[PDB]
Design a protein around this ligand. Structure first.
Ligand SMILES: [Mg+2]
Ligand SMILES: [Mg+2]
Ligand SMILES: [Mg+2]
Ligand SMILES: [Mg+2]
Ligand SMILES: [Mg+2]
Ligand SMILES: [Mg+2]
Ligand SMILES: [Mg+2]
Ligand SMILES: [Mg+2]
Ligand SMILES: [Mg+2]
Ligand SMILES: [Mg+2]
Ligand SMILES: [Mg+2]
Ligand SMILES: [Mg+2]
Ligand SMILES: [Mg+2]
Ligand SMILES: [Mg+2]
Ligand SMILES: [Mg+2]
Ligand SMILES: [Mg+2]
Ligand SMILES: [Mg+2]
Ligand SMILES: [Mg+2]
Ligand SMILES: [Mg+2]
Ligand SMILES: [Mg+2]
Ligand SMILES: [Mg+2]
Ligand SMILES: [Mg+2]
Ligand SMILES: [Mg+2]
Ligand SMILES: [Mg+2]
Ligand SMILES: [Mg+2]
Ligand SMILES: [Mg+2]
Ligand SMILES: [Mg+2]
Ligand SMILES: [Mg+2]
Ligand SMILES: [Zn+2]
Lengths: 38, 84, 136, 94, 136
RNA sequence: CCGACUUACCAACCCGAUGCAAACUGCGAAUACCGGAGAAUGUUAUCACGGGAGACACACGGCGGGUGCUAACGUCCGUC
RNA sequence: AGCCAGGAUGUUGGCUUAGAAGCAGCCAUCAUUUAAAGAAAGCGUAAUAGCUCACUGGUCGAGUCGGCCUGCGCGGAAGA
RNA sequence: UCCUCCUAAAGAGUAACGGAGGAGCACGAAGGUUGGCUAAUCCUGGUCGGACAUCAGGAGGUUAGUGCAAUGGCAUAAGCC
RNA sequence: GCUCAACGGAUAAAAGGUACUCCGGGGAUAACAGGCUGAUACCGCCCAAGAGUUCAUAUCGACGGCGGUGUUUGGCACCUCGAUGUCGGCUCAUCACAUCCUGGGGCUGAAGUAGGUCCCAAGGGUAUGGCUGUUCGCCAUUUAAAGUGGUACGCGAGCUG
């Protein structure tokens, strides 16, 4: 997981989801696109 | 070192202010000899009853009321006096 | 002169020369020739040459990609691919200086089922980084 | 062909114009010919969508004031320095 | 590195960055980058933005720089005390008011010009926006 | 014997479109200042002369600036 | 939305390249049967292969999608 | 110590080890007066002579000039004889 | 008749040392510490040309941009000159977390072993010597590890000198 201030979709399989008040990018294709705002 | 020594400026000089400008404005009642404007060059030219000194000081050559006006082909600023 | 190496592929032809009637001496011209070599070499900005050598690698078909990657990684430009029945035969001019320990690395990528035969090909210009390293 | 419903300004000046723009209208003037110039105010957003067309600035516009028709041309436009808004519009009759 | 070739004087007062801008319209190209905020653009900042912006469009179209660094900025050296004259000129800047168009672009599609200005505005301290040419 | 052309080179002056300036001005305020007249208000609040001084280390805040980093409960001026 | 089905013939377009087969990179980006289909948006292959998308037909049967402006919030946000 | 400009906020004045420059003279004519005269630069043509010397014409209009810095001024010239 | 130019001109006529010092004063004015600030420094983040065989973001990251801390070198001179003892060591500590070890986890160019890089976590723990007054530093040998910083660069009415 990459924790940074600027999370964004790196492919079409990336999805922006807000969980427990934090923005997250989850990818169904490959896990290097997993990101956390912070 | 603990402190770095500075340089020195080279611009410290200036000259005294010469108190130039208009002494009596339009509508002033002046005596003969009163200085109206102190100038460098003739920014204001001498009109009626007004004299111009060596340093282009405009002074009253009669008693009366000061009036500024614009005359001549060059739109120059003349100072004259209505004798009153 | 640049880095103490045997200069190759140099073509020089003598056309003009001078001599002193009584002081003409073979040794003098020999030394003088060396002098001329010095200035000429500097202005020609030479480039060091590495022993680029052709390399033939045989490997299983399923591991063809692994082999190609490693060959490329070692600054070696491939020139041919042979689709032999029992695995593919690849060829490349991998720099000898770069190719060290390649056998052991190759085995891991080919499940210890490959081999290679090396044959020196030609001395080629060294890349700036590599050339400078040797110079220093 | 464009019909612009505009109402004549009751008050003018810097304070009035800034109050007008806050209320989402903006001032404009119509001058030309021989009649005295008429200071009108009109809705910002309607004209903002209207002037996104390129043909707005060439073809003859229509302005309706007090139910009376004035045939005008978009002479000039003053825009906000950075926001997509119109400060003022100069209109010429006929 | 944009910089005046010669100047009448080498140092200038600090001044104040007040008022709105002049040159708020796209006068040369078809697209433009317009400053929303106010501040100072160093020649390094302007030039870094220009490199990204001209490289984004693959050296196509035409690029216009609408701003010039003409205000010299002085800095006192590290660990020198106050006074002893004004500091030495370190760099140049342009003063930027809200609404000023900083860069213009032509000859490229709008979707490409928009992307190029995004990369260019990533290098600037002041808020920007994308504008296009309009008929007045 | 004075010549007449030409090309994808450099190209000054000039023209059109753009900006910038404390030591630029073909423009130009608001205020401030000087003077004349009029009312109202103000315990003469004004000036002159004379007796007595103290004071000449200022501080912060607003506004206009120089310097500094439009850093400083920094520093230096104007004005309240 | 989703689900079912297709997503095809020049063709592996040419150039380049050890290979460039829609998908390293260049130029072109045209024809065909079509209900539709890109000389291909992306994953994948050393190159193939393979997997989706664009697009289309059916199924469902009522609203849905994307920008612009703007109010208040969210993350960025660690000290004895 | 003195002069010029900016800071200096359109009267005067206004500080800093603020930003830039000068003066410690010269001239019996370079002063007084009368009369007379008007530049820089560029183009065209012309012996040496050319980018640039003197000459003719034109454009232009003070972009020159001022014994010496800068500012203000100067054609009725304060500039030149 | 005065570069009386230190130009309102002390006299016609005048340079230095003091750690052997002395007096009157000032925190009006410096050195230590505190304070304000944060250019610089350190830490974090924004955009991604490129390195990484191919692949920007496993790991780095040019040209540039925005913050945080008070933490280095500084800037200021607000407090103390009718005194706030100034480096290092010893003894004894205590806090913060921007975590050195141990604990939990995501990604990896993570086969395993061993790492890399982020996120959470401050309960405990976190060397001995050689050389130099040294803090540091280099070196020798250990350790699971030999953390970073604040506490008047903690601590002399506790010691050393
Ligand atoms: Mg100077
Ligand atoms: Mg108002
Ligand atoms: Mg005093
Ligand atoms: Mg005083
Ligand atoms: Mg004061
Ligand atoms: Mg103060
Ligand atoms: Mg491919
Ligand atoms: Mg926020
Ligand atoms: Mg004044
Ligand atoms: Mg004033
Ligand atoms: Mg004296
Ligand atoms: Mg004196
Ligand atoms: Mg004493
Ligand atoms: Mg004392
Ligand atoms: Mg004090
Ligand atoms: Mg201190
Ligand atoms: Mg003070
Ligand atoms: Mg204290
Ligand atoms: Mg003390
Ligand atoms: Mg006491
Ligand atoms: Mg933590
Ligand atoms: Mg417990
Ligand atoms: Mg010991
Ligand atoms: Mg500590
Ligand atoms: Mg201590
Ligand atoms: Mg103690
Ligand atoms: Mg004791
Ligand atoms: Mg004791
Ligand atoms: Zn993804």
């Amino acid at each position: 997981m990459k924790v940074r201030a600027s999370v964004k979709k790196l492919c079409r399989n990336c999805k922006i989801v807000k969980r427990d008040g934090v923005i997250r990018v989850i990818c169904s294709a490959e896990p290097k696109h997993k990101q956390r705002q912070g | 070192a603990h402190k770095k020594a500075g340089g020195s400026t080279r611009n410290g000089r200036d000259s005294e202010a010469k108190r130039l400008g208009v002494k009596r404005f339009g509508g002033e009642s002046v005596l003969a000899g009163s200085i109206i404007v102190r100038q460098r060059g003739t920014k204001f030219h001498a009109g009626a009853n007004v004299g111009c000194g060596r340093d282009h000081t405009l002074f009253a050559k009669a008693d009366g009321k000061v009036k500024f006006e614009v005359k001549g082909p060059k739109n120059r600023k003349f100072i004259s006096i209505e004798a009153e | 002169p640049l880095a103490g190496y045997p200069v190759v592929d140099m073509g020089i032809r003598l056309h003009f020369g001078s001599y002193h009637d009584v002081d003409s001496s073979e040794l003098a011209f020999k030394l003088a020739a060396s002098i001329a070599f010095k200035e000429g070499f500097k202005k020609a900005k030479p480039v060091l040459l590495e022993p680029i050598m052709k390399v033939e690698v045989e490997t299983p078909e399923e591991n063809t990609g692994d082999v190609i990657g490693d060959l490329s990684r070692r600054r070696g430009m491939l020139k041919g691919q042979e689709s032999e029945v029992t695995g593919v035969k690849i060829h490349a001019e991998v720099p000898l200086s770069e190719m060290f320990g390649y056998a052991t690395q190759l085995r891991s990528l080919t499940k210890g089922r490959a081999s290679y035969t090396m044959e020196f090909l030609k001395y080629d210009e060294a890349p700036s980084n590599v050339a400078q390293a040797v110079i220093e | 062909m464009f019909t612009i419903n505009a109402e004549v300004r009751k008050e003018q000046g810097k304070g009035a114009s800034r109050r007008l723009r806050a209320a989402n209208k903006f001032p404009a003037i119509i001058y030309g010919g021989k009649e005295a110039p008429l200071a009108i105010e009109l809705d910002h957003d309607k004209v903002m969508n209207m002037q996104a067309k390129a043909e707005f600035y060439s073809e003859v516009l229509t302005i309706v004031v007090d139910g009376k028709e004035i045939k005008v041309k978009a002479q000039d436009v003053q825009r906000h320095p950075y926001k997509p808004k119109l400060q003022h519009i100069d209109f010429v009759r006929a | 590195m944009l910089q005046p070739k010669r100047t009448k004087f080498r140092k200038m007062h600090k001044g104040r960055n007040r008022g709105l801008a002049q040159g708020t319209d796209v006068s040369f190209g078809s697209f433009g980058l317009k400053a929303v905020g106010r501040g100072r653009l160093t020649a390094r900042q302007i030039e870094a933005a220009r490199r990204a912006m001209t490289r984004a469009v693959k050296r196509q179209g035409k690029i216009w720089i609408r701003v010039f660094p003409d205000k010299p900025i002085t800095e006192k050296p590290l660990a020198v005390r106050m006074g002893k004259g004004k500091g030495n000129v370190e760099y140049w800047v342009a003063l930027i008011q809200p609404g000023k168009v900083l860069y213009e672009m032509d000859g490229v599609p709008e979707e490409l010009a928009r992307e190029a200005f995004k990369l260019a505005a990533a290098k600037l301290p002041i808020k920007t926006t994308f504008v296009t040419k309009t008929v007045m």
